[PDB]
Homo-oligomer: A and B are copies of this chain.
Amino acid sequence: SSAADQQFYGQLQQELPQMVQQINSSDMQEQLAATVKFRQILSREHNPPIDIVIQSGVVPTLVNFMNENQPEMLQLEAAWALTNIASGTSAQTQVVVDAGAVPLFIQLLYTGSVELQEQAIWALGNVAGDSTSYRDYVLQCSAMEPILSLFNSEKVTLIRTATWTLSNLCRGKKPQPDWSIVSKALPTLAKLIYSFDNETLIDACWAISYLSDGPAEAIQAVIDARIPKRLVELLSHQSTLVQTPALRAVGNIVTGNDLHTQVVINCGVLSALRNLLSSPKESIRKEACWTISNITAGNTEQIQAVVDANLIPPLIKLLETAEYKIKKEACWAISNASSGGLQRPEIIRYMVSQGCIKPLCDLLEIADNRIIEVTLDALENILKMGETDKEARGLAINENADLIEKAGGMEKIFNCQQNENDRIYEKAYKIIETYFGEELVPRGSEVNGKRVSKTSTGKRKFHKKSKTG
C-alpha cells in the first residue's frame, strides 16, 4: 500500500465526522457538497473505502436524496455513491438494498434525465450482478419494463449501460431468472446484436448466452426471435470478446434437439466452427470442439454435414497434438460421430481414412477415466463398423481390428483391463474378447498352474513375404 493510500485513510478518518454533519445539514447546498465528497471518495479507482462509509451511517441519507422531491443534481450524486457501494462485496450491497434503494433506482428510470437514467440503470446492474437473490428482487420490483423502454434512447452510453444490466438480469442458473420476465428482453437483444458499438455487442451476446442456457423452451424462444443467424455471423467477428459469448450461445442451442441444431447448420455454423478451430486463443478452440461434438451427436445428416464441411481432418490434428483440454473435446466430437456413424458406415470409413485410429489409441494412456470410456467407445464403434463390413464382403479379417493393432492401439486397449474402474475394465475386456480374442488365450497348457501371459509379446513380425526376385 502506497504512501498515498495510507495518508488518504488517515485524512478520511479525521475528516469523516464533518462530512457526516455536512450531509445532515438543512441547507441543500451543504447536502450536495457533502454528497459530492462521498461520491468522490467512493469513485476512487483503487480501494474505495466502502465499509468506512457504510459504518458512518449515511447510506439511509443518500437513499433519501434519491426521492421524488429532491433536486436532480442531488439524486445523481447520491445514486452514483450508492452505485459504487453496491459494486462491492455482497455484504456491502445489502446495506443498499435493505435501505430501500432499488425501488428508487427504478423510479429514477422514469423521472430522471438521460444522466440519471444512466446512473440508476448502472446501480441496478451492480445489485443484480451480486446474486440470484438480488437479481430476482430487482426483477420482483418490476424493473424489466422501464429498463426495456430505455432502448428507444439513442444515447450510446445509456444503451451500453442498460445492455450490461440486462445481461446481469438474465444471468444465473440456480435458480434461473423468472422466464416470463426475462424473455420479454429477446426482441430488444435481437436488435442489439446488430449494433455497431462493440461493448453493446459484447453484453448483448452474453445476455443471449444466458437466456439460451436453459431448457428447450428457452432455446426455441431464441430461434423464434431470429437471433441464431446473426449469432453465427458474429462467429467471424474480428474480436474474441464477441466470438466468445456468441460461440457459447450457439453451443447452448445445439444442446437442443435435431430441429434446434439444424437451424444453426442452415445458417452456416459449420464453416464458422472450422475457422474457429484455428483461433489463436485456446478457450475458443476448446469451445468450438465442444460445440461440434453436440452436432456430431445429432442425425446422420448432421454428421454427414460435419464431414461435408471438412471438419474431420482438423479434429484429428487437435486430437493428436493439442493440449489435453482440447484433445478431450476433439475426442468427444469424433466419438459421437463414430456412434451415429454406424447407420451410415461410409462416415466411419472416411474417418478411419483420415487417420483417426492412432490418435484415439494414443490418448487412452493419458486420459482421465471419463475420456478413456468415450475413447474406448469410439474404437468399439470403429471395430463394430469393421465387423459388419467384414461379413458383408466375406472378408477373413476385420480390417479395423488390423489397423488398431498395427497402430499399437491394441495393447493400450488390453492394458486398460488393469483399471480400478469396473466400467472401463468391463468395456475394455469386451473389445478384446470380441475383436482380439487371441490376446486372451494363454501361451501353453492352461491346467498346470504355470504362468498366464498373452502368448508372450515377442511374437514374430511379418507373416507374408512378396517374391522380389
Q: With a CB–CB cut-off of 8 A, which chain B residues contact A370?
A: 418
Tell me the complex Cα distance, A287–B441, Å.
Answer: 18
Given contacts A130-B396, A287-B458, A456-B251, contact A450 B297 (CB under 8 A): yes
B294, A451: Cβ atoms closer than 8 Å: yes
- Please, which residue of chain B has its CB at the minimum distance from the CB of A440? B174
Binds B, one of A60-68, A184-192, A214-222: A214-222
Query: Which of B130, B332, B457 is within 8 Å of A451, CB to CB?
Result: B332
B256, A463: Cβ atoms closer than 8 Å: no
Nearest CB of chain B from residue A469's CB, rounded to whole Å:
7
Say yes or no for A152: interface residue by CB 8 A criterion.
no
Given contacts A94-B396, A297-B449, A449-B297, contact A455 B168 (CB under 8 A): no
- Please, which residue of chain B has its CB at the minimum distance from the CB of A48? B466
Nearest CB of chain B from residue A263's CB, rounded to whole Å:
14
A: contact size bracket: 35 or more
A438, B129: Cβ atoms closer than 8 Å: no
Contacts of A218-269 to chain B: CB distance below 8 A: 219, 244-245, 248, 251-257, 260
Q: With a CB–CB cut-off of 8 A, which chain B residues contact A437?
A: 174
B467, A213: Cβ atoms closer than 8 Å: no
A293, B451: Cβ atoms closer than 8 Å: yes
B418, A421: Cβ atoms closer than 8 Å: no
Tell me the complex Cα distance, A464–B122, Å.
Answer: 9
Q: With a CB–CB cut-off of 8 A, which chain B residues contact A466?
A: 42-43, 48, 83-84, 87-88, 126
Given contacts A171-B463, A458-B248, contact A131 B469 (CB under 8 A): no
Q: Mark A167-203, 1 if CB is under 8 A from B, else 0.
A: 0100111100000000000000000000000000000
A–B Cβ pairs within 8 angstroms, 25 of them: A43-B467, A43-B468, A86-B464, A87-B466, A87-B467, A88-B466, A91-B399, A125-B464, A130-B463, A133-B396, A134-B396, A171-B463, A174-B441, A212-B444, A214-B444, A215-B445, A251-B443, A251-B444, A255-B450, A260-B445, A283-B458, A286-B458, A287-B458, A297-B450, A420-B421
Which A residues are within 8 Å of any B CB, using their own CB? 42-43, 45, 48, 80, 83-84, 86-91, 93-94, 98, 119, 122, 125-126, 129-134, 164, 168, 171-174, 206, 212-216, 219, 244-245, 248, 251-257, 260, 283, 286-287, 290, 293-294, 297, 332, 368-370, 393-397, 399, 402, 418, 420-421, 437-438, 441-451, 453, 455-458, 460, 463-469
